[PDB]
Amino acid sequence: MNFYSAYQHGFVRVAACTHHTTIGDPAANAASVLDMARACHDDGAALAVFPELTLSGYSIEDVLLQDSLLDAVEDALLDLVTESADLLPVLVVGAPLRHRHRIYNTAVVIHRGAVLGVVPKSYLPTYREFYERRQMAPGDGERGTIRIGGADVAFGTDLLFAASDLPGFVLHVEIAEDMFVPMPPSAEAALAGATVLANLSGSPITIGRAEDRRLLARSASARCLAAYVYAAAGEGESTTDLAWDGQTMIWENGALLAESERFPKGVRRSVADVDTELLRSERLRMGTFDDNRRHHRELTESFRRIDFALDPPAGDIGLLREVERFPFVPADPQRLQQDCYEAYNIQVSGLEQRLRALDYPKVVIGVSGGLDSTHALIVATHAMDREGRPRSDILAFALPGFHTKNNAIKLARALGVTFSEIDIGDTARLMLHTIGHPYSVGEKVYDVTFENVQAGLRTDYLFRIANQRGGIVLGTGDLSELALGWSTYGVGDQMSHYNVNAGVPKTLIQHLIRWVISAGEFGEKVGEVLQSVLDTEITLQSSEAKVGPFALQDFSLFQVLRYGFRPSKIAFLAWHAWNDAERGNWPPGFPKSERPSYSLAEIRHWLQIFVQRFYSFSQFKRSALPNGPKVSHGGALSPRGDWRAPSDMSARIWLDQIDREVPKG
Amino acid sequence: MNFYSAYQHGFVRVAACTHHTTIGDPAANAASVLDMARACHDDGAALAVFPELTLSGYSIEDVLLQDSLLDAVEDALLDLVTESADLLPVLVVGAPLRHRHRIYNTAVVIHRGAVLGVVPKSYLPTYREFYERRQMAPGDGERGTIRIGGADVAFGTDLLFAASDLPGFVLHVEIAEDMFVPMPPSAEAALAGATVLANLSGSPITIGRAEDRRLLARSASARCLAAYVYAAAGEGESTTDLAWDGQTMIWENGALLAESERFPKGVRRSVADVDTELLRSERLRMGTFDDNRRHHRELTESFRRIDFALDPPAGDIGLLREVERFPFVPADPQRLQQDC
Amino acid sequence: MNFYSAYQHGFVRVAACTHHTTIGDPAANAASVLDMARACHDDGAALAVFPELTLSGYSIEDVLLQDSLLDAVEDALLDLVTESADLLPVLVVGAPLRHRHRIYNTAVVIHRGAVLGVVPKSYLPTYREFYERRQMAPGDGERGTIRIGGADVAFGTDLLFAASDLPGFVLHVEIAEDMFVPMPPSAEAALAGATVLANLSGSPITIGRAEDRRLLARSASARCLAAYVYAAAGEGESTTDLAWDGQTMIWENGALLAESERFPKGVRRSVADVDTELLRSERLRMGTFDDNRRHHRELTESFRRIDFALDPPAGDIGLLREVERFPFVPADPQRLQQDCYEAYNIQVSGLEQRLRALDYPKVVIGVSGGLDSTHALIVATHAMDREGRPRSDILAFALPGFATGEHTKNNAIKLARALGVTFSEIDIGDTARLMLHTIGHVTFENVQAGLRTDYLFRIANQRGGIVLGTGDLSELALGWSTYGVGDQMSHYNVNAGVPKTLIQHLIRWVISAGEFGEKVGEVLQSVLDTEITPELIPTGEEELQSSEAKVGPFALQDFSLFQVLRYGFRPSKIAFLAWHAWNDAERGNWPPGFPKSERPSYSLAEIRHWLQIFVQRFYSFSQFKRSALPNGPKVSHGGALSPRGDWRAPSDMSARIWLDQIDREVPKG
Ligand SMILES: Nc1ncnc2c1ncn2[C@@H]1O[C@H](COS(=O)(=O)NC(=O)c2cccnc2)[C@@H](O)[C@H]1O
Ligand SMILES: Nc1ncnc2c1ncn2[C@@H]1O[C@H](COS(=O)(=O)NC(=O)c2cccnc2)[C@@H](O)[C@H]1O
Ligand SMILES: Nc1ncnc2c1ncn2[C@@H]1O[C@H](COS(=O)(=O)NC(=O)c2cccnc2)[C@@H](O)[C@H]1O
Ligand SMILES: Nc1ncnc2c1ncn2[C@@H]1O[C@H](COS(=O)(=O)NC(=O)c2cccnc2)[C@@H](O)[C@H]1O
Ligand SMILES: NC(=O)CC[C@H](N)C(=O)O
Ligand SMILES: NC(=O)CC[C@H](N)C(=O)O
Ligand SMILES: [Cl-]
């Protein structure tokens, strides 16, 4: 495959256009529309949506009832169709059309020189500033065909336009008022299989109406797990009694993909790349979506599929989509503040409940002065506080084996816990002898068993101290560690009584500590020590030198855990997010010296290591996993929760797919 | 008329409650619920909504399948009903109930010492952190009655609880996952005439889930031109694998009427005065609303109306609602900037 | 509540009767029926089912069309109805009745002086020895009412007879051939809410037809998750061309509850107590049952519920049910052998796969010479064998700390050396002695357990192997472990599925199969004799009996565990079941291998005490230990305790309601 073709990774480029209305002049509306569609063609778009009653103007009132206007609309529409023979995108053009007795408010769905369909507006508003049932007829329940340019084409509120070469691209078209009713045609359509929901809108602008437009469009994209395309009327509509801002916007599953200047001077587009695979995946996993479709089986099987071949460009056309470098760490400072709040509080509260259950025991914790331990200790302190329990019931322990520990003791004494040292070294010596390891005879062999003796002894001592003094062993291994198997399983740091860092990726612990210093509720000196830890630990490096940088691994982990995306898709997404340090945004707290940019070769390498460790090696360590709360919306790794997977499975197909699809550089 | 009685001007006081879950202890959940409902009574509320699976705890997994638990749930539920004989508000209490073959995730709608109804959850999520189809059965399409305390009461996803003395107050009840699907029971219900939409929710909290809760609840209140009552589970739910923030909130036609402290220490309420007349009027003028109901006439006439007499206090009880001095000039500076 | 009332524990007493047919004399058939019904009444039964065409005789052919016969049938049916006013059970009597144009092959459902309903046969067989469509009419699709004794009563294949005071008791009635077709009426009815499926059957006996009766009846009870009551025609049916064996049986969820003597001289009954709660629970947990009902919603909502108040006897009437002492260990030698074969094979095969995955590592196991470690070693050996891998990759380890010396460590060394594994001993004492001192010294037993597991893990790191745990299902249930750094943790637990009552018989199975050496067999029997016999003077206070002293006898806790894990039964129901199973050692069966010196009888007091301990340790304490549990294969049908499998429960939950129920309902003695 061409790795850099957005289309070949499941994307589909869509455009929401606002054009220059020339009320009463259909030929000039068709001119503006043709020019913008030709732009969409140059941009590689597959879809282009224009505003309500595009070809005549929405605001012309009883001028819709004049035969000369309807005739010019027909002529301009046929010109448009003929011109669309050389245009890539599917044009969705509003128009007042003649059928049976009346004129209906229709969107003509045009493609490659033919009319795929004609959708009538379903609910014509007749209230306040709207007088639509005067001039036009409702379409709710109209099926059959309509005759347009010597051809009988599908007509009704029950169409679907499915791309035969892009199965993720299945189009449905409603109009303005349609999406504001309790049961919108688009919802049925989505259950019926529509993935891109289009809305043509005239929408006279008003104080607070753009807010309502966004509310309903976003809510639609989320509830229907689909993409939503909205286009409103702009410059040219009669200002006899209304004004027009020409807003266009593109939503996808609740997230604004793009939007355009309000009240512009001149035509505007919103062009974006819709990840059909993200929709596919959200729908694969949300059983209740298909359950809802089944409950409404009769309503949903009555849709008609009009198949068409899009044949998109197969080359490099960029990616009109903002792939954030940190799926777990939003780069918008306000959103990151909210995220850190939520994470920190769910950790504290999960620990609080575990503590209340056990008659308020003690909290035994081994603190190394690194990030995860620091944060876990902060968490336990707050949990104990909110429960009105002495901080002296927290028992921090520095357990040296064979510079950073000073952070740990400074922090422990600042917080007010019970600090203590236990030099496991001698117990390690004894054990290494009793098993006959070369180090007890004096040859420096620092293999795995050497290091695991110390790790397991730290955990062993903590467990026995908990048993002796009546407490519980708080864990500190974080989500990215679980995803990679970067722990000692069993007798080791993997085991504990209640891990509060279990659901937190490594990349978000840094910002949780930054958040705690910012909130600074523990005190000034405590902020000083925490800040010290932050500056000390970043310049983890040891950890990230065998499993790769956690920025790239949390990127891959998010893609896998949330979407199950194949390796090639993760490589493409990571390369667009990370390959350039200047492009895209960075979250707060990243000095320009700690703002790296990774290459495709690096992404490919760490992706190989990731698929190997996550699908295959590491699973068994998560399989027997202490309790602890889920944090991110990307998921957790509990086998009693978000990740049910086998312990004895190989990652051959993932490595093989990387081999076949991801280029070496 | 008593000019200062909010009820006599079309208002109806509603409460969204988060209580103290005691997982596995139905009697203690009923205790917390009774205390909060007694508060709602003192506040003059007509409606009080509690979280998903209130009487047993939402997070207890296969403990729902133990006969001793189900039996204690039945006992606590009957105590609650009997105590509600002296309580003004309509109690909406979650519970795992026994019907036909399985246990359904139900909300018991209780009023003045009787059970007006029993609504089952419609879409049981079985994905990610959710394992609900294991223990419980879907209610989508279940009609008929259920036997609760020597009485056959209405059972199904098609109920409406209409106040015979407050025609603007017509209640419908869905549960959690119900409002997240493309076609939620509440929308049908609203076309069918429901004005106050209740949602009992367990909702394990997550980064960005409260945003989604608000998005869908507000979007529901706007699209359905109705009031939306949301109540999530709080302190007490098993933190084996999830955490719980206990958010409660009250929306009305897209506008947040009230909300409560997230991650509280102790029970919380959101009590607000819903202007049923504002809903009545928005619906009088939006023709396309009734047009939508007509297009779905068969779906919408199949609802069952359970009538009940609320008899609210007729005196001065304040007005739990922020009436802005300038309907044209919003007092929030950011909103006023946008408006200008 | 009365603790000894089978009814107040969800049971219902049912009867399948074969009577003395007197072909052509409806009065004489009503006489036999009334006598047997009065018997069932004295027994306290709620239901009594009689054979096809009871009042007339199934075999009287065209005499069914004689008006005098039909009239005598109606007269005897009305007599029966009137007499039933003082009869506890619901009578289901066959009769050829007049409706619209023809006579239908009906079962009259009679109760307390009134006719609850009239169910016609649905599929009249007309083939081979059967000529039923000649005299009678099919009832498939007949609804409405029928006039019987000046009363309009329900008539059709769509009825349900539900007890208003016994909600688990919902009766459906079909007739003979009905249950032999691809889609029997009883399956629909079960989906519709039927719990007891009744069959009136004439059934001329033939070589192998009792086999077909049993096959289909048991299959019905299993698939429909119901009780199936069967009654066939006996002495008195015309032997002009057929013979009649009068078989009656009562099935429950695929398990034969009762049956009667074939070809008897004189009438017979099969009376049993059906556990409605068992059905209720099987249906609570099998979502696909309700899934199937919903898929056929039209068929299943069309049923009509006829309500009747049974008012059963509230006293002690015993329990006509064989409750086995060892729910995990069947007392039938053939079934126990099959069980043990299956269990042993799934353990071996699960370990085989885990090993193939890891390119065949070594197998580190600490062997103390107790049952669980012994069996785990045997399984590991067999797994290594069948995968064609050197037995010297099995690393057994005796890690003693404070034991002075005992026969069990010799058991360990002897078995390991007889198997040909790689045995080594390592005295953890010093590390514990150091460890204790370092933490500033109950605690020391915790330290030893921790250090055993720590050392095994580090040795597996050193020599490139996986620690193979030995914890069994009973220890997991009750929390008899050291969590985390302790005997709970391993890389793969082969014994997790197996309860402790079954480990002994797995070892006996291995011995009797004798696939290993005769020396291996002798040492295994030594292990059995050593561990299952209490030490005269406690050997250092560590063995199997120590766990028994703290958590109660496993014979009782495995019983409670099966009930809880499979059926979710309330404590009082468990106490009732166990008290009937165990209180009398001379009654019921024992599995093979119990010398009559090891056959105890437990009291209500003991059952109640250990049940308190059990609900407290299972619902509340021990859950957090299972929550983080190594891999391993599920063994019994009763379930496992994996959090990724059969038991999803909270770690921070109290057992208060179960204790409160034990206090409110189970007597102190
Ligand atoms: N001096 C100390 N005092 C007290 N507690 C200490 C001390 N040192 C460590 N810890 C503990 O280990 C946790 C983090 O472990 S680690 O060093 O980041 N990673 C590994 O061991 C590792 C990596 C890969 C595979 N296997 C093992 C820390 O939270 C803390 O609980
Ligand atoms: N799927 C499995 N199921 C059950 N047991 C398994 C499975 N795979 C291996 N093992 C065994 O568990 C021990 C794992 O070692 S460790 O202390 O967690 N960490 C390390 O080795 C380590 C090495 C290199 C880099 N980073 C960490 C091993 O000895 C192995 O015998
Ligand atoms: N001397 C030994 N040599 C070699 N391996 C040994 C030795 N002793 C034990 N093991 C091992 O521990 C497994 C089971 O332990 S136990 O004795 O039944 N009970 C407990 O540990 C216990 C009970 C209650 C609370 N906490 C701990 C055994 O299968 C064996 O693998
Ligand atoms: N729900 C929980 N979640 C997480 N951690 C918990 C929880 N409850 C306690 N803990 C802690 O874990 C240790 C477990 O100890 S143990 O080695 O498995 N043996 C024993 O408890 C034991 C006690 C009495 C008699 N016999 C055995 C406990 O001391 C406690 O500190
Ligand atoms: N033009 C229309 O159909 C009405 C659209 C307008 N935005 C509304 O919300 O009603
Ligand atoms: N408990 C549930 O049914 C799920 C509610 C959860 N808030 C969701 O959006 O799916
Ligand atoms: Cl072990």
Residue numbers in the entry:
A (entry chain C): 1 to 402, 407 to 543, 554 to 679
B (entry chain C): 1 to 340
C (entry chain B): 1 to 441, 452 to 679
Task: Please give sentences taken from the publication describing this entry.
In this crystal structure, we found one SFI molecule occupying the NaAD+-binding site and another SFI along with PPi bound in ATP-binding site (SFI-1 and SFI-2, respectively). Closure of the P2 loop observed in subunit Bsyn reveals two close contacts, the first between the P2 loop residue Glu552TB and N-(nicotinyl)sulfamoyl linkage of SFI bound in the ATP-binding site (SFI-2), and the second between the one O atoms of PPi and Glu541TB, a terminal residue of α16 adjacent to P2 loop. The nicotinic ring like moiety of the SFI bound in the NaAD+-binding site is highly flexible due to the absence of protein–ligand interactions. Interestingly, the ordering of the P loops in subunit Bsyn (and symBsyn in octamer) could induce a productive binding mode of glutamine (Gln-P) activating the glutaminase active site in the uncoupled active site (Cglu and symCglu Fig. 3g).
Both structures are snapshots of the enzymes in the allosteric state with the synthetase active site loop ordered revealing an exclusive rearrangement of the glutaminase active site and the molecular tunnels.
